[PDB]
Amino acid sequence: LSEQLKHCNGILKELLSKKHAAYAWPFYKPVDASALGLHDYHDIIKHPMDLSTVKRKMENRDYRDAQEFAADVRLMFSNCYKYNPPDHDVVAMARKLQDVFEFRYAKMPD
Ligand SMILES: CCOC(=O)Nc1cc(-c2ccc(C)c(NS(C)(=O)=O)c2)nn2c(C)nnc12
């Protein structure tokens, strides 16, 4: 891990931590469209993403740089904003978790 990717790994640890679990847990595993009845989910969302996938990629040392890590995390959030109306509970949860991500990601030394 580069120093930037070590920083990203620490961010991932925080996003997965009990501190944020009350709004992070819908992002812990891939959206299960069949169980939830999200009929059009895989038509609307071309590239699903979630924290278990980010965690797998980081653990396997698959990210080439910090930008690749950030793109996945933002893809996860953007999918949630794209699929859901603005007043849905899960959009508010996404925003609270993204507050954590964007602030800590911005503090990455460069
Ligand atoms: C028409 C109503 O729209 C929605 O219900 N939307 C969304 C719902 C949930 C969601 C809820 C409850 C549970 C138990 C789960 N679990 S999981 C990760 O296995 O699928 C997920 N996540 N979500 C994400 C991300 N993005 N959108 C949604």
Specify the number of domains making up the chain: 1
Give the number of other CB atoms < 10 A from CB of residue 90: 15
Task: State the structure-solving technique.
Answer: X-ray
Resolution (A): 1.5
Q: List all residues 6 or more positions away from 73 whose beta carbon is below 8 Å from its beta carbon.
A: 15, 49, 54, 101, 105
Q: List all residues 6 or more positions away from 25 whose beta carbon is below 8 Å from its beta carbon.
A: none
Give the number of other CB atoms < 10 A from CB of residue 22: 10
Out of 28, 34, 36, 51, mutate this one to test ligand 1's pocket (max ligand atoms within 8 Å of CB): namely 36
Structural domain of 34: 1-110
**Distance from C-alpha of 54 to C-alpha of 35, rounded to nearest angstrom:** 22
**Distance from C-alpha of 102 to C-alpha of 40, rounded to nearest angstrom:** 29
What's the farthest any 2 CA atoms get from each other in the chain? 43
Q: List all residues 6 or more positions away from 99 whose beta carbon is below 8 Å from its beta carbon.
A: none
Q: How far is the CA of 3 from the centre of ligand 1 (A)?
A: 34
Atom of ligand 1 nearest to the CA of 30: 18
**Distance from C-alpha of 28 to C-alpha of 90, rounded to nearest angstrom:** 13
CA-wise closest residue to 94 among 108, 109, 105, 81: 81
Helices assigned H by DSSP within 31-88: 33-36, 41-44, 51-59, 66-83
